[PDB]
Structures are given as C-alpha cells and as structure tokens.
Amino acid sequence: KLPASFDAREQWPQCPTIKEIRDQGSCGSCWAFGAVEAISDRICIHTNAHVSVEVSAEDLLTCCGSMCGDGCNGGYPAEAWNFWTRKGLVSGGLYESHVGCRPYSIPPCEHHVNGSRPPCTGEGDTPKCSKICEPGYSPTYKQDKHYGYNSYSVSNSEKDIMAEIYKNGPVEGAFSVYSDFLLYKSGVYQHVTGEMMGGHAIRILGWGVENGTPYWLVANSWNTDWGDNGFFKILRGQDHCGIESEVVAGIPRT
C-alpha cells in the first residue's frame, strides 16, 4: 500500500541532503551526481539521521575510472553504485565549500539560464583521482569511506520504483533530455518536441499528481537557478523519456 503522493524531503525532514541541489558544473558527471545525491540521502535515512554527510561527487567521478565510463564525458549509473559497494565513497561538499573529505573541484555555472555565474561550457577534463582528504578534514580518506551494502537496478515499473523510494529513499534514474526540457520552469514536464540532447542521470525523490497528471519529483544537478529551484516534475507511469527504465539504488553499509 503506497501513498498517492510522496516527497522524501517531508518523510525524512532530518536529512538535509534530500533537499539539496548540487551543480555538476561544465562536466558531464550527471551519472555520478545522481548516485552520490541518492547515496547521501540513504545514508542519513539508513541511520535515522545519526549520520548525515554529503557524499563526494568528486570521489566517484575521479576514482571509479573506466569501469564507470568516461568521467566528465559520460558514465554508467549502474557502475556508480557498484563502485560505492566495492570501493566506498568519501564525503565531499560543493565547490569551494571546504566541506568533507573531497569537495567538488569543478566550478558551478549557468545551465541554460542567465545568472551571476559563468555560463557552462562543454564537458571539460576529468579531474585526477586523488585519494586524500582536503586539509583540516578528519578522518583520513580511507577511514572516511562510506560503503554500499548492495546495489541493484529497479524494474521498469512505476509501482516498483515508488515502493523502492518509499521504503529505502531516493534513487538514481536517467532519461532522454530533449531540447524542450532545457527551459523547464514548473509543472509536469511532458516531452512534445525537440532535439534529443543525450541521456541524463538524476535523483528521483518522490511522486504525485498535479491536476490529474501523475509525476515523479526529480532533483537535477544544474544548480538552484535552473528549473523549479533545481528540481523538476516529469510524467510518471509511461516510462516517459525512459524515466522508469534506468533506475538504480542500493542499501548503505553501516
């Protein structure tokens, strides 16, 4: 029995990461961001908020290597969660936050919107895998690793995905980004036209029905000035743009 609407931000109010929107910068690291964001949320949910950390996008992006794909050139969500179970992920906050072991090294930028930051450019170089924490942070890189207990894909079934989010927290997903999605502002996105811009991985954290239209509540990784404060809603129940076909998650290892 699942609720008709659900928002992980309201279900687990003591988990700040669930509400946080990150910026992948000028790097096609969405595959890593959707994973570390969901993992962050799950670690907090898993420990009843006793442990709440921003898992490092940098660590995943830079240290997984070819197994996860091509760093800033694109990657595989499935392997992102596998890396978490196999090698673990240290903490790390936003660019220049000096938060955590390995904060993100790529600067934030304007993603399809005007703003005070520089406009995003084409996927840059992937930073090096540096297995050491930033100065002043404790514990050591090895000791700060947070491991996944397991990882799995979720079937292409809205009920299965809703049940997964309901029970275990936000998940990572991916969908086809068309040009008519770029200027999203609010409402339930439904693809009607546009050039297929490429697959994009994100974090799904809830669902609902807005004026009869069923939707998934999703966090993008394009900062807070893109979309609806960084989030968006997309049509649910018809594997729209493949939104229900690339869902992956996993349970944290204490």
UniProtKB/Swiss-Prot annotation:
Q: Which residues carry this modification: N6-acetyllysine?
A: 142
Q: Which cysteines are joined by disulfide bonds?
A: 15-44, 27-72, 63-129, 64-68, 101-133, 109-120
Annotated active site residues, numbered on this chain, are: 30, 200, 220
Where in the sequence does glycosylation occur per the annotation? 114
State the protein's name.
Cathepsin B
Which gene carries the instructions for this protein?
Answer: CTSB
